[PDB]
Amino acid sequence: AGGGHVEDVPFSFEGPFGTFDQHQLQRGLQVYTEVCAACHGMKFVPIRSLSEPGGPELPEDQVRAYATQFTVTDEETGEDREGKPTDHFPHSALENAPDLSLMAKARAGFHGPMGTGISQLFNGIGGPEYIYSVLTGFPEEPPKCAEGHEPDGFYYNRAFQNGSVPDTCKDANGVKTTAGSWIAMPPPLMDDLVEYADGHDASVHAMAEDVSAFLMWAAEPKLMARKQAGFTAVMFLTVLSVLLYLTNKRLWAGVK
Amino acid sequence: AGGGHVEDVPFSFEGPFGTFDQHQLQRGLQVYTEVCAACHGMKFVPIRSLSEPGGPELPEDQVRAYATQFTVTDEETGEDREGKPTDHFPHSALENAPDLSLMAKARAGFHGPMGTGISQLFNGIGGPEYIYSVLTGFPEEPPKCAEGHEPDGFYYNRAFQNGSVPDTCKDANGVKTTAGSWIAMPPPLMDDLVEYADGHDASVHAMAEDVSAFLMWAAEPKLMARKQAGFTAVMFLTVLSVLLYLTNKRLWAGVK
Amino acid sequence: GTRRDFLYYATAGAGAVATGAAVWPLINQMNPSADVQALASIFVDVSSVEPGVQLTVKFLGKPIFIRRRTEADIELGRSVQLGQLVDTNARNANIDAGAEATDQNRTLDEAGEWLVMWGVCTHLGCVPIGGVSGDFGGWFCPCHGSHYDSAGRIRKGPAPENLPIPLAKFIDETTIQLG
Amino acid sequence: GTRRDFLYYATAGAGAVATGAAVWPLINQMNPSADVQALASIFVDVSSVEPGVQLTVKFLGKPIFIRRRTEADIELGRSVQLGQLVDTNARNANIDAGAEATDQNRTLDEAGEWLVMWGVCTHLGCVPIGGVSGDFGGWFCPCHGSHYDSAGRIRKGPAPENLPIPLAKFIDETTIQLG
Amino acid sequence: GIPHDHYEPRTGIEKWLHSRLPIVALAYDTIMIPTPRNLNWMWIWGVVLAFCLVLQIVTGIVLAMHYTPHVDLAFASVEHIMRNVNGGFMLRYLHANGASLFFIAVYLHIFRGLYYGSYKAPREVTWIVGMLIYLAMMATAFMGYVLPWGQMSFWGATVITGLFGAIPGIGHSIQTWLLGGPAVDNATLNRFFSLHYLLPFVIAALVAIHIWAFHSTGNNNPTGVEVRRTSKAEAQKDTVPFWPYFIIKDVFALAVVLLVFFAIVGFMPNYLGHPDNYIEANPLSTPAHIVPEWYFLPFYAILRAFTADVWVVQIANFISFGIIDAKFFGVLAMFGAILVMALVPWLDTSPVRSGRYRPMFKIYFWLLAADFVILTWVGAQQTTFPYDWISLIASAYWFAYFLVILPILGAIEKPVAPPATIEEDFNAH
Amino acid sequence: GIPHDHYEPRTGIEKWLHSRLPIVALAYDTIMIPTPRNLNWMWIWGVVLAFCLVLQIVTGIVLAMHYTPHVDLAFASVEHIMRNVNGGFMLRYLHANGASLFFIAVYLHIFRGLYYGSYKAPREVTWIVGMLIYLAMMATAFMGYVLPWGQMSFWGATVITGLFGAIPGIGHSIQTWLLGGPAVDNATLNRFFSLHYLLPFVIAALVAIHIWAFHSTGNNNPTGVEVRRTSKAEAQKDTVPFWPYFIIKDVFALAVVLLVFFAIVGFMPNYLGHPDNYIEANPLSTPAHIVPEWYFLPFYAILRAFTADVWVVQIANFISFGIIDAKFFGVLAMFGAILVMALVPWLDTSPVRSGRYRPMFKIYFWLLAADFVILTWVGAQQTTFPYDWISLIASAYWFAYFLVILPILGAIEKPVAPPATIEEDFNAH
């Protein structure tokens, strides 16, 4: 396998002052619920966190209603029940569909250049960009080298790099010719597959960016708290360094 | 509740040089499987330990055959299967039947006298004596004070002290008059309920003594290993103390 | 003037704040986490509870007692006079905090058949033994010897208060909601 | 005389033994416990495995590859001469330790259809990638770039040896016993 | 300090090391310190305590390699140790009974100090560092006892954390913070495990300061007469070097102690334990006969002796406008019993160091030893009559000894003349 | 040592304490030690290391209050911290990125010593104690990284334990003993947890000896010319007391380091990590791009550079009758890279302390610093051409520097005269 090209999306949460867009996270939650959830789970995300500040911030009554749709096995009782906000999202229904709880952090979209790490230093790790690229990177026709050599049950995706590749798509030393490789996920999105309440656009591009942002929050729910803390410590330590500098300077005056 | 009197059984494993009787442990294993196992489990005992030295020491082929009767849920597969020696004995089938893995150590048969602890110091804790006393202590007639006042679903036992007691069996200050109290366990034994292979007698006394020894091994399987080490450490330290005594004496000789 | 005396004070003041900012989160991480703060109500099916049976249920890591009281339990409770009680407060989250501990104020229903309370001894937190135990036809705590009567009111022992009653109400004909 | 010379040696010698007797059990508790020592064989259902399919199974915390080899896999494996292999030992627990790494000695059956081996790279223990990867129509280890052929023999990279073959035998028409 | 000869590097390797890091000089000056010649067998308990800390640490680290601090796995992982880990049964019993040996030794160590005046000047610092060590030990042993997650673990934790809920105003916050929730649950087990590991290292640091303390002043001896320091000549008549004379004597005593200890571990490892802790924690049912480990019983007896009917409790309740009830009073009494013992250098107003030469003091001292045994015994009994009174008389004497008798004794007693020197006492033996 | 004034008790409380435990005298003589006046910004990394050790310890203790060392619960318990535990996200990133800060500082600390000759006599003990600390740090960090039980955790643990399987004869025994079984499993996680807690306390003990070591000799300084000890007059011209002059200078520098550090933690906490450790351990599938943490990369690059085709490996294999194959040679090379650095006091044959006055030495040193950066970078690349060669040339230079250049240089180089005294150098700047 290897790294590959991802579409550089300008997400609101990027940059030191970057923060989540509340409506986008809500739309992404709808996309996850109506599309991804059929196969993918989020077993580490507590459902109650849809109400917590710094996320979709849904009313606690809506979240209570949202949790009901899941059938959970009660821990004490052992009998089935409606879901509560204190429960996690279920595991992936499809056994080989990975859990998406931490997907936005378990994938890197930016690499290199000479394995110096300078790309990530300026553009970030690039997980939500990577997710977006996979949801977007399904072409209608496969590459010409495999017109009739596609593995059955797999799909060409421009951004997926860990997939198999037909022998007719490799060069004389066996390196693959194609930009991407074959992924076991069929194209999950399609224009207006979801009906957003506020009338926000639901193109594959729009849903992919919305659900990529939601999945970034699901992985790093405390992103906004972490930056507030970073800013605070940095403003503090700027002041503290200046005061300690003047003290150090004014002390050594009686020496040199 | 409180403490009470137990029948002082002479178990082979008692005393510093005491050891388990292999055939007795096998008889007790037969009693547990054929009588107790209907309600009680041993969730901490690996089945393979029936072969380990210092216990019943059954041949590994017999133990392999014994483990089959249990239906175990494989952890990865999730489907049911026959038991292996690497599996533990099952949980208690009856929800309020306590686990017997550690019963012979989780009960004290000797108490007192004035809470000085001298009784246990000389007679041991008395857990297997207690188990024996409970299995023995089911009388055909209850105490005269409750002739027609027995709680339904309970049975009078001489040795059980933590059970309920009818209002008619308490004095003016509410302390119980009876030697024992009412236990939810029906009398489990009866003469020749088990047919021992070696022809050992299967009176209620014999099965109770045999299975109490088995339950002591299931609770303290490494008893014999512990005593060899105890003897060894004491023999080392006896020699070492003598040598250290002569050294200390012969050293201070050049002072006084 | 105050220019060379003030720097060594302002610097030390910043250092004190910095230490405090480092120490508070080290303490607060031991305070209840988000998973604990969020634990919510539960519902208990009670149709199977005959008079004279106590159902014991776990709620917030502690026992909750649900006793369907018999006629004898109820008669004893109303026969106790207020001036004979150790604690005359209802300890009831469902009513006024100052309400008196009459037997009517200790049950969910007017008939006084359904007694729901925290099974947590008010001395040091042990579980009292039920099934009509003790000297007052109620509960006996084996940890240091408190006796509660048939309405869960403290009568004897180290415990200072009646067993507290949680928020509890019948949501329908056969279900109690705790919390 | 040897009365005053022997005590300072005999006493210290006893101390040396006593320390050693105390240190050994502190080391040996880290050796495999009885639950680990007791792990036994397992059985694998194979009826669903068509040629060209690799079944991957966990055994003693490591992967075991059970591949039903295709015609191409078998031809490539049998076409390799002994002098062309990095490691010429079969690494097969079921036969003599000195057997040669011919394709016949690398499969369970005479037809050479069933290749059972530890999916544990002999370099530093990673899992080789199966299907038809690498430069020898076999397995590729992504950790440091070892290539194995269609019989699981090392051909290129840092790995010193062929993937080992565990004790494995068909118990009936459709079940293999590992261990 | 005391006059003595110093280290001198001899080998070429020693001259090299000594001019860079004088660690060899430090071991020599430590192990060759002139120690009073007349120390009796009550001076061994320091080495026994030192051994216990190492035993507990080494068996502890090993046990933690196989233990899981999770409520679903904790109890099972200890049985896994007992049954499956090589020597796990022996390592476990050594750690458990090793805690008992640790505590028999401090109490003997402490009462030695209380008799011979090892707490009076110049030894206050040694004594105060000791008190901190003791507090750490109790906190360590408590949390350790919770880790198996048996019935005593869970309900002992319930009882002991409830003590802190009794503090007015702040009690409920302290209790919740310690528990990590509304009740003893996984959060409590998980954090006690981290702290059970940490605190033994804090104890080791305190012991390091403790050792530094009595090396600075020099060891006390049964006569209470200090080593003569005016010249090396007369210091040697009062002393012998710690190595070999008292090293071997301590090591001998240790071998005898371990002989008995290994007989316990080998042949009655559960005598000092509670069978109810071989039952899994049940948050819905409480053992009828919950009782603390014997080394906590005296102080536990003090706590429960002060009920609402006690006349001194009713005055406290009246004067404090209801703030100090029996529950909180009993908590004040329990920490108060240790505190008055910490203050004994300033409560013992007598200028005579050794209790050996204090005729009236011996009586009150031996009553205190008997009281401590009585207190240990009543702690495990019920609170009914007469034990309720027995615990009241026993608690009462403890405070009377430190707060009334010892101050009064130092202003009334007629002491016997001690020996002129340490040398005089030794030759008479 | 250096001439300086000693402590004198002034307050009555100070006279009281000093006559029992001179801990204030010890703290005073420590914080007022005459330190060379001419220390530059490369002398701050000792305090940073001290701070890191406290940060790791304090955040570590806290994390262990919420972490579960069991394969079924470990990964979930870290996410529980991240999402639910108060400040858990920040405490985790501080501990994780804190390890990186810890390790950037040692490498800067080490190369400072290598340039200025802080390892040459009389500072060998300081240097050797330093090498043990580094080994303990690496061992702690390796085991720490396993605890989350992600994919890098599991397979990094598989690889690194496989290194010990490469030892002839005894390799499989050591490997099984470390693993507790045939493979990386729960037994491995459970014991790594116990040891991850213990070793930081061993590090702390080593640091105490470390500080004692360079306090005994006095700090080296940029000129390599030792402080004059012939009189107090000229000691004062070479030095200032550690407090306040260098306390404040270090605290200032520390605040600047933490400003950068907290920006990383606040704004790019995952930059220095591997995304695959956010994937749960899969004992059946291995990430394609497994790569070590940056602070292990240079030595990892050394390990894999010595393959079977390398001419020097093939000689080793033939002469040793096959015992030393490429795998074990790489293991020898890896621990060997650390060992020659431990032996540099005995390999550097120049009598000139500071490399500042060694013209040829400066060249090879900066090549070594460059080589170390190169080695770090190739560590993260594949082993194909040309990286296989880059890692061979880089590894070769590492051993050449310590084993050939440094021994040869001390008998060839024409060094420049250093200043006569520290005072001369200070006034010129």
Ligand code: HEC
């Ligand atoms: C079943 C009909 C699916 C639905 C709907 C979605 N996904 Fe999926 N996904 C599925 C499979 C079988 C796999 C495994 C692919 C493989 O070759 O292993 C996946 C995988 C992903 C991945 C991982 C890509 C990678 O780098 O490994 C991602 C990032 C992903 N899926 C995202 C995703 C989203 C956002 C979805 C809803 C819009 C979604 N998937 C739906 C099966 C199915």
Ligand code: HEM
């Ligand atoms: C882990 C616990 C402890 C250790 C390792 C320890 C160690 C020692 C040692 C080795 C000695 C010297 C030998 C001796 O006199 O026995 C000593 C002396 C002493 N210790 Fe402790 N001790 C511990 C606990 C305590 C406690 C809990 C106290 C007091 C409450 C205490 C107070 C003293 C005193 C007063 C002395 C006498 C010193 C002197 O005579 O100058 N110690 N200790």
Ligand code: HEM
């Ligand atoms: C002064 C030091 C110590 C004291 C007084 C002490 C005391 C105790 C006690 C009383 C128990 C309960 C044992 C039982 O009833 O089964 C215990 C348990 C335990 N301790 Fe310690 N301990 C100490 C040090 C340590 C250390 C340093 C560690 C780990 C590194 C440790 C690890 C454990 C573990 C894992 C348990 C639970 C397993 C068991 O019950 O044996 N202990 N400790």
Ligand code: HEM
């Ligand atoms: C936790 C790790 C460490 C801590 C806290 C630490 C601490 C210190 C401190 C505070 C100093 C004072 C002067 C200075 O900052 O340079 C120092 C000096 C020194 N350290 Fe470290 N160090 C650590 C690791 C190391 C390592 C890993 C090495 C070498 C492999 C090392 C070797 C030295 C040397 C040679 C000196 C100079 C001694 C002198 O000038 O006499 N240290 N160290």
Ligand code: HEM
């Ligand atoms: C003093 C030097 C220490 C170093 C260099 C160190 C290093 C590390 C590292 C690299 C990790 C992996 C963190 C991650 O990337 O997720 C880690 C995890 C951990 N460390 Fe430490 N550690 C140190 C001390 C301690 C101490 C004293 C503790 C005490 C409990 C501790 C507790 C933990 C825990 C519980 C984890 C797992 C949770 C997590 O991954 O955040 N560490 N440590």
Ligand SMILES: C[C@@]1(c2ccc(Oc3ccccc3)cc2)OC(=O)N(Nc2ccccc2)C1=O
């Ligand atoms: C070993 C023991 C213990 C040890 C030291 C203690 O000392 C204190 C520690 C902290 C706070 C208060 C006292 C308390 C209990 O731990 C524990 O749970 N118990 N058991 C127990 C039983 C009944 C009531 C209370 C406790 C102890 O004995």
Ligand SMILES: C[C@@]1(c2ccc(Oc3ccccc3)cc2)OC(=O)N(Nc2ccccc2)C1=O
């Ligand atoms: C953090 C790290 C690490 C740190 C210091 C080390 O130092 C050694 C420790 C033990 C033995 C030899 C070196 C080794 C690994 O541990 C770990 O899982 N990794 N990751 C890793 C990835 C691929 C191969 C090998 C390791 C480390 O970098």
Ligand SMILES: CCCCCCCCO[C@@H]1O[C@H](CO)[C@@H](O)[C@H](O)[C@H]1O
């Ligand atoms: C290099 C030392 C300063 C680090 C703090 C700079 C602020 C980093 O800010 C980060 O930058 C990344 C791209 O640069 C983005 O991916 C992140 O969204 C952003 O948080």
Ligand SMILES: CCCCCCCCO[C@@H]1O[C@H](CO)[C@@H](O)[C@H](O)[C@H]1O
């Ligand atoms: C007094 C200190 C030495 C104690 C060791 C004496 C040997 C104790 O031996 C024990 O006695 C118990 C009965 O008391 C028995 O239950 C045990 O089986 C036996 O091992």
Ligand code: FES
């Ligand atoms: S806890 Fe119920 S009486 Fe003390």
Ligand code: FES
């Ligand atoms: S682990 Fe397979 S190549 Fe190194």
Ligand SMILES: [Sr+2]
């Ligand atoms: Sr972007």
